[PDB]
């Protein structure tokens, strides 16, 4: 994967400085496992999940339905984290997701900046920011259209 | 014109406010965004800086950054910048906001969900990278900016 001009090679910024940062870094290694069963155990029952160009999931049940649904048509082949920071109960990861669109077998590097809210070491919020359209026209999978 | 705060926005009262010096810089820069002045905004930048709204190409050095900002203000006006979350670590500042944008060609407005990262040394911006869904904004205000 690409390590951009702007991504500092002070390779921490980039490592976990707080326990939450270590949880978020752990969570994203579970991402490449591609099973929403293992991922959902990091969530509190009162929680959210929203890839922002798509509609949000609220509560633990809805989050599982969305994660699972994603894995029905896509796969994480790699998650690369350049910058990880945290203030005020919030973690921020500026990373790159390597996604294989399952129905078309095609792959893409999604540049993504995410925010996680943790509460007693449980994810109470997860919001991924990126351009949905450039993912779609690159892997032929219009996830909204 | 007015943003209502989403139900997921952290209720920690500090999350909303500037938690460090770097953060209040980045917060004030955000208000200068409503000045729609690339020459005013370019002030906040160290000169070995960069800028990238992430569905668009990166601009490196203040040269491009001011010019890139300049080209955007040709078809766009920031009406408002509502910052829900702001935090910092290891020299970077992150803002989770809503940008109330208006297309000068069509007059239409759309509130764009942004997570931005600002790289700060100096007290001067050395990197600024906005993440958001571009297609959503374009369709909404009818102003193709990539297609």
From Swiss-Prot, chain A:
It catalyses: limonene 1,2-epoxide + H2O = limonene-1,2-diol. This is Limonene-1,2-epoxide hydrolase. Pathway: Terpene metabolism; (4R)-limonene degradation; (1S,4R)-1-hydroxylimonen-2-one from (4R)-limonene: step 2/3. InterPro entries: LEH (IPR013100), NTF2-like_dom_sf (IPR032710). Optimum temperature is 50 degrees Celsius. SUPFAM superfamilies: NTF2-like. Optimum pH is 7. One of its GO terms (molecular function) is limonene-1,2-epoxide hydrolase activity. Changing residue 95 to A/H/K/Q: Impaired protein folding and no activity. The active site is at 97 (proton donor), 128 (proton acceptor). Catalyzes the conversion of limonene-1,2-epoxide to limonene-1,2-diol. Can use both the (-) and (+) isomers of limonene-1,2-epoxide as substrates and also has some activity with 1-methylcyclohexene oxide, cyclohexene oxide and indene oxide as substrates. Belongs to the limonene-1,2-epoxide hydrolase family. Monomer. It comes from the Bacteria. Keywords: Hydrolase. Induction: By growth on monoterpenes. Its EC number is 3.3.2.8.
